[PDB]
Design a protein around this motif. Sequence first.
Motif, short mmCIF file in Angstrom:
data_model
loop_
_atom_site.label_atom_id
_atom_site.label_comp_id
_atom_site.label_asym_id
_atom_site.label_seq_id
_atom_site.Cartn_x
_atom_site.Cartn_y
_atom_site.Cartn_z
N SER A 79 -5.32 -22.36 -0.27
CA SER A 79 -3.91 -22.17 -0.14
C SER A 79 -3.75 -20.69 -0.14
O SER A 79 -4.12 -20.01 -1.09
N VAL A 80 -3.23 -20.16 0.98
CA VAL A 80 -3.18 -18.76 1.26
C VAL A 80 -1.85 -18.31 0.72
O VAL A 80 -1.19 -19.12 0.08
N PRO A 81 -1.41 -17.09 0.89
CA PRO A 81 -0.07 -16.75 0.48
C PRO A 81 0.68 -16.64 1.76
O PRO A 81 0.08 -16.29 2.77
N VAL A 82 1.97 -17.00 1.77
CA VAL A 82 2.79 -16.86 2.94
C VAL A 82 4.07 -16.23 2.49
O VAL A 82 4.41 -16.27 1.30
N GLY A 83 4.79 -15.59 3.43
CA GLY A 83 6.06 -14.99 3.14
C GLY A 83 6.35 -14.03 4.23
O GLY A 83 5.69 -14.01 5.27
N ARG A 84 7.31 -13.13 3.95
CA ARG A 84 7.51 -11.92 4.70
C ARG A 84 6.96 -10.83 3.83
O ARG A 84 7.01 -9.65 4.16
N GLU A 85 6.40 -11.22 2.66
CA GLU A 85 5.61 -10.38 1.81
C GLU A 85 4.18 -10.51 2.22
O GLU A 85 3.30 -10.01 1.52
N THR A 86 3.90 -11.10 3.40
CA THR A 86 2.59 -11.06 3.99
C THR A 86 2.65 -10.08 5.13
O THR A 86 1.63 -9.75 5.71
N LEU A 87 3.85 -9.57 5.47
CA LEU A 87 3.97 -8.56 6.49
C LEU A 87 3.39 -7.27 6.00
O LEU A 87 3.84 -6.74 4.99
N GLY A 88 2.45 -6.71 6.78
CA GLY A 88 1.91 -5.40 6.55
C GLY A 88 0.92 -5.24 5.44
O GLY A 88 1.08 -4.35 4.62
N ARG A 89 -0.17 -6.03 5.44
CA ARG A 89 -1.27 -5.69 4.58
C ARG A 89 -2.43 -6.44 5.13
O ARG A 89 -2.25 -7.37 5.90
N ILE A 90 -3.65 -6.03 4.74
CA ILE A 90 -4.85 -6.63 5.24
C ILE A 90 -5.19 -7.67 4.23
O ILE A 90 -5.23 -7.41 3.03
N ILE A 91 -5.40 -8.89 4.73
CA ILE A 91 -5.47 -10.10 3.97
C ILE A 91 -6.82 -10.59 4.35
O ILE A 91 -7.11 -10.68 5.54
N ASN A 92 -7.70 -10.91 3.37
CA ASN A 92 -9.04 -11.33 3.70
C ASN A 92 -9.02 -12.82 3.82
O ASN A 92 -7.96 -13.43 3.78
N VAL A 93 -10.21 -13.43 4.00
CA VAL A 93 -10.40 -14.82 4.35
C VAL A 93 -9.76 -15.72 3.33
O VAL A 93 -9.07 -16.67 3.69
N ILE A 94 -9.89 -15.37 2.03
CA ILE A 94 -9.40 -16.19 0.96
C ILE A 94 -8.06 -15.64 0.53
O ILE A 94 -7.35 -16.30 -0.22
N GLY A 95 -7.64 -14.50 1.10
CA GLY A 95 -6.28 -14.03 1.01
C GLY A 95 -6.16 -12.73 0.29
O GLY A 95 -5.09 -12.13 0.29
#
Lengths: 470, 469, 53, 501
Positions: A79-95
């Motif tokens: 379960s990854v993180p979702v939002g508009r707080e996922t805008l603009g950062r590098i997110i790895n495979v597990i998040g």
Amino acid sequence: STPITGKVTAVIGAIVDVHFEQSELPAILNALEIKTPQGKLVLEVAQHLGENTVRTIAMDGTEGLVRGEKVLDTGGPISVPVGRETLGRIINVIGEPIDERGPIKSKLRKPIHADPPSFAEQSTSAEILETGIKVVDLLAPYARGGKIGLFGGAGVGKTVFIQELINNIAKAHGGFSVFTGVGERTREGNDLYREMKETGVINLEGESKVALVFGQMNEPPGARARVALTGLTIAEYFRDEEGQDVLLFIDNIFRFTQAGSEVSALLGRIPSAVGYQPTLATDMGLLQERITTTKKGSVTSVQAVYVPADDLTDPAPATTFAHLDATTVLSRGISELGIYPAVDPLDSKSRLLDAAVVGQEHYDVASKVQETLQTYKSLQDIIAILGMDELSEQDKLTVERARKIQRFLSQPFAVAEVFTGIPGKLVRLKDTVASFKAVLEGKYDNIPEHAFYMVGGIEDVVAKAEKLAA
Amino acid sequence: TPITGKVTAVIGAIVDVHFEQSELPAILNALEIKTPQGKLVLEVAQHLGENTVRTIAMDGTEGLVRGEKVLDTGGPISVPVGRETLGRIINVIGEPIDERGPIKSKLRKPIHADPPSFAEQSTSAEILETGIKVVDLLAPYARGGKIGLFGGAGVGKTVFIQELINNIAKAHGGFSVFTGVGERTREGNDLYREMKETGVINLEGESKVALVFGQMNEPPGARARVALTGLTIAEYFRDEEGQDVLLFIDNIFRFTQAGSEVSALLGRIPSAVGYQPTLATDMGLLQERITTTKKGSVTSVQAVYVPADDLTDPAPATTFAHLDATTVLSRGISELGIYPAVDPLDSKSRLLDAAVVGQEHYDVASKVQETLQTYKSLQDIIAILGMDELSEQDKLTVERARKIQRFLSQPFAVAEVFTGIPGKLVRLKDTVASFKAVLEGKYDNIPEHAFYMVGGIEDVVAKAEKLAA
Amino acid sequence: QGYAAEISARRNAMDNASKNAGDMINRYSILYNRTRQAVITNELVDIITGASS
Amino acid sequence: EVSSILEERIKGVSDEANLNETGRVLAVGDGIARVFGLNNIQAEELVEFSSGVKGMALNLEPGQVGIVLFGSDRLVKEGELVKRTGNIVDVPVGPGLLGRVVDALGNPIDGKGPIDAAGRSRAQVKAPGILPRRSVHEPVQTGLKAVDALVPIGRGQRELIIGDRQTGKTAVALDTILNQKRWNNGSDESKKLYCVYVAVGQKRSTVAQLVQTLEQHDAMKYSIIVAATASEAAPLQYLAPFTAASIGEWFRDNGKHALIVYDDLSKQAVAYRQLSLLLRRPPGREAYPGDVFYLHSRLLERAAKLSEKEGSGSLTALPVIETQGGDVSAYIPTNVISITDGQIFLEAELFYKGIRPAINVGLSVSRVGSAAQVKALKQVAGSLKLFLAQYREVAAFAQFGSDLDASTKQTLVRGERLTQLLKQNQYSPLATEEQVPLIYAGVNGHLDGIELSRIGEFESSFLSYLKSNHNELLTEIREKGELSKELLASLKSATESFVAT
């Protein structure tokens, strides 16, 4: 927490089998976390082999593991993180924030798996997307909410082509974008991170109009498979829940195919044709079907594909060839001709090119171009042996026009001011149709062939004619 | 106490024994099963654990009754070495197959031995003249070197080597080893006779050559360890006698090939084109135990029977790795009638250099390569159109190259019998001159037929007079 | 006279060209056919090896 | 003396304590043992067989833990005990490896006395992230004119040397090492490259000659030579690039800039193929296990140009791939091509054609980097590429009896001269300051007229002439690295002066 504890039984590469105790057996597609000095190793449950033993695939390097190591189950697909707080950062495979942006998530997480929307959900589209790249605009116009497909081989400056699209289209588009890199270099990564910080799409002050999910080739094959799913779910959150227009970009899906082929062998599945997984069609299908413009938001996906050794008869490119709406081939020969875009025009087919969709005029201009270029290619053999002799004067003018057209398709890229130096031209689609129309009429047959080469629109072509004239 | 066993299995020539007592076997031990056909020698190759070995059997395994008494002789098969190896042709175990009775020995040495250390290595490059024009010109050999031949299917693979033995080893005074793995027996008898006749083997006197000969009839397993046996004989000369040795091996394809046979039976999932997955290690061991060290300079000559005439096959590929010179000989150049059949664009040596054979030689070679490469390039045009339709400047190059191609065929002395043409041994000093002249177009003014199958440049001139008549 | 000889000569030449090219077709055709079979064989070996495992 | 040292060695043996874990060998042979026991055991751990053999462990199975030997089979026997080293594979890493030939374990095989190691490291270390990197701003010039101009090499960047085996394949790389003598002789650590030449799968004789060559050109005094000769174990060969990599990382970590040649990477693949096929993993395409791609990718991505914050330390990589049959469609070459940041195809036909270097420039690219070459040399070679591309096109057209017009033959004539200009003899690196003039002359067509045979003479003589008069000019090219107006004019006048005489 539930005492779903398993003790590892076999570490044999990525495949790690776990021996959960009786009556507490996980469910296929669950997510196991194992506390390690490497944080938590995540194992994705992928088979039951009975007798309270699962066979799961690792998401992280399996070196230094202990045979019999206690395994907690967090259940369900990662379960990854979702939002508009996922805008603009590098997110790895597990998040995890692989750019040290600290906690990522708005208020929600979502699973890596999601089902592909049903037939009922599907909603037809037939928009238009102007890229400014003349060849694309005239001979294979894209359409918003599409499933654009960048077939090309190794090192066709594949990233560079995509970079141009991001430079123009992404900044222009109001929709969020997600740049997802599956198995691409950290050399490419550092450049992309830097470049998109520069183009400001990633604004390190304000909100970024793009997110990054960088999965790199140094990550295990298992992790490489589930970079795609993670990115896809972020896009789905935008598409569905935020309702927004998206403008997804993923790289490179041969790495996804390849990754699946590798762990297929490891999973014990008897290799299929050209060593690819026997589940090749359906695994591709799940990814491709998931990406679609429905009643919810329009995902304008641009999906990179790497064609091994430019062999399109190979099943992995050939299967993908069907699944994407608007194919484009970027061929080596054309690169070698010095033409960047390297787009091979007769080998770029689009369902979006029609005498209705873009109308009769656009179509007719492009139809004449296609015939002209095809004539030049057919005649090339005649020119090779026979030469200019028993070859018609009319044909010779057509050949001359084709050479002009060939280099009229040559126009620089802004993101190849560093890979050339001439700045690219975002030539209006309507203007391109007109300008190419002029050429066909032979209204600019007084203009040097090289005065079409690596410049923009007709105005520029004339200017370079004058420049060369001097 | 006797490490008795019974033969649990006889799956091909990969017998498995089950040792009773818990006295351990050890990998690469040798076992003697006494049979009423005399003893049978087997070599422990795997331990399957629980006192069940799986053993390669050198000689045939027919007759074996499942549950046959064994005795473990311990350690790898021990050859017998001495000066008495010289002038004797020996079986794998070491028994004289030429039936020259008991070979008196001082040291009996294990077939397996470790490759000498990186520290012990010593590198040199004393240009050996073969008196074969093509060899000298294109890729001269050098002392201590590892020489390579990639001859096709029965292209007189042996014949090329025989000429070399006739020239180089009678011009070598030190010890020399002939090892023929899986070679046709009749040719071997001819060789044995020829050597005895040319006194290299002098049975009354001493022989400066020793021989190990392995018939192509012999069971695969024997052929597999024929090499290791010979390799020991070479080491004895290299080390213990100290004297500079020579070594001839024909075919080292048989070494690989044999390995491919046993591997499957041994219990290995085989690599592509069926080749053994232990190909790299096995080849590696064989070729690093053949080397010029402080102990002695062993010039070695290795012959590869290219299988199906494909050189991209893995067995030829790993050979290319371990050689200092190669002289690929191909069926096509043979078909053109050029004897020797050495490909001139597929020969190389590290011993061809301007600091080795001098700037003049290197310059001469540069032009030879360039002309021939052009000539090969225009083969398409030559076929599609006429040769007159070739560009005039190029037509001169082509005519020169056509001459060069014919010139390179030099009659051989062992071939002299077969061809009927008297052999020609042309000096290295003569060769440089001869080609130099041709490159300066001096004698380019006389027919291709004149250049065909003749020796030195002077011989061409004389043959022009002959041809003119 | 010259022009007639030129045109006559090219007719002869182009005829002979056709014959020589034909031979090359036959040679590459055999190579093609053998190679096609060989590809099937090479693929099969991979399949057998997989099945055995 | 020798007695005291021996006394020290014996003295350095003393006492022991209870050994944790044991297990008994059962089936064993091939080089792959399987032992029963070892319940606690880290993966990739080194386990000491009682024979004396040390072996990494690649399979942990709920039956029999599969320990791959790094020693000979003959030493090992049934039911032997193996006691776990307790260390995941690790290498001594230090400064002392400079000027040392070392085997995979790290013991000197040239025996210049035991290595001086400042640490130990682990053989599997994951690639530096996106966060610790800077973009490549520091050239590294090989001193081969075709390479520097056409395929610019920059520190960090992985650049693939690919082509037909031992057609001086090693020699192309050795030339780079030799030109890195020029910086080595010089000063400033970050302007120096240390050099690690890794030799996997090559015969002892080739290697011995190679180390001899390096000592001959007296370029041994800043090299590490990591070797795994042909005889040596397939497990040791598989481990060999990865243990070379860690030694490189010690430089990278130090902020030092260095370059690692992985010759032949193709032999790593053969090794992993063997390893897998005797661990009985299902075999991949062409019997190379599928995670060969993974193996190569993780290895190659460890070399990088770090961030300024992370000391910039640029390990630069040059993989070398033998191309069997010269067809790169084979699985291992295809895989590598994707991984690497450039391709430097070499072609055999061009070797025979007498282009030495025989690098085929049509197939050679450096897909990234252009601040990876000197500004001056970039300016001059701006149309060197164009001219060459045109030469290639024109030459192609010329085939099959087409009677060229004079304009095409201007290109052809110009083009031919460039080809002669490129050629360089093995083990003859050049100074970039004196490669800029040669290209200026060629590109500005001053050589076009000059007769084809005496181009080499012109090259030699021109250099001598520039040494004689315009040695001030050369100093400036070294100092400013971009041609100024004054330099362009000076150079133009000089070049003109030497066209005749």
